[PDB]
Amino acid sequence: IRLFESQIPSHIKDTMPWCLVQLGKLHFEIINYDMSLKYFNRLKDLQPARVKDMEIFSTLLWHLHDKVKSSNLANGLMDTMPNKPETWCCIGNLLSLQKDHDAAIKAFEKATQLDPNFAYAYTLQGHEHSSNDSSDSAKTCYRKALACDPQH
């Protein structure tokens, strides 16, 4: 973040979508929730129909309980690409945000079926399975999550 502040010009910083994504993910990692949202909104302003890595935003907006923006983003993402796994995991995150979670598990497993090498879908599945007061399924899901991404 200090390197952004010093070694990155402001005009490049507030214009590059990739720098915005990296900066938002970084501020997520420091658990700076307010900072990340007002730049991810700028990212959506730059291009609404971009998927890349929307898992971070889905995780953020689940915490902030913004049901309407999440609904809009999920609708737009599906209308753009149905086969990208991040879109399906965002939908499952919204569904878990609402209330029902069995269909969220099913959506997550389908998203993992679209691309077996997506570790964040596995780890989101495992984190969700804790809410199902079930541990063995959660434990197996966590193990298969860590299998996909060694450093997670």
Binding site: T140, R143, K144, L146, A147, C148, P150
Partner: protein, 120 residues
């Protein structure tokens, strides 16, 4: 002959017959489920011979020729945990869990490896 000398708890001659088998088949036909058996059995003999480096090499080679193999990844976890290469051990063990979630020894192996890593 190598397999049966292995089963007879006489490993040294089993290795020489399996080494001869490997060298006969080395030049031709790396594929076709024959060299796979040769390297797997030879690596098993080394792991039972207590020499680990060439066993790891052979297991890595056969893993290159075949990735979907829970037993291979379990053996890699065994060999890596025998040495102090904990990260490779846990990585291959998690791979084995991914290939087959319900493995008996693998769960205890993961628990022991994680505990050793934390205490390290």
């Amino acid at each position: 002959m190598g397999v049966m000398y292995f089963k007879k708890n006489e490993f040294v001659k089993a290795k020489k017959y399996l080494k001869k088998a490997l060298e006969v088949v080395k030049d031709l036909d790396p594929s076709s489920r024959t060299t796979i058996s040769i390297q797997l059995n030879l690596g098993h003999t080394y792991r039972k011979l207590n020499e680990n480096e060439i066993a790891i090499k052979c297991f890595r080679c056969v893993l290159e020729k075949n990735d979907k193999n829970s037993e291979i990844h379990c053996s890699l976890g065994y060999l890596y945990l025998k040495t102090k290469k904990l990260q490779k051990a846990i990585d291959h063990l998690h791979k084995s869990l991914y290939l087959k979630p319900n493995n008996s020894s693998a769960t205890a192996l993961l628990k022991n490896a994680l505990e050793l890593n934390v205490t390290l």
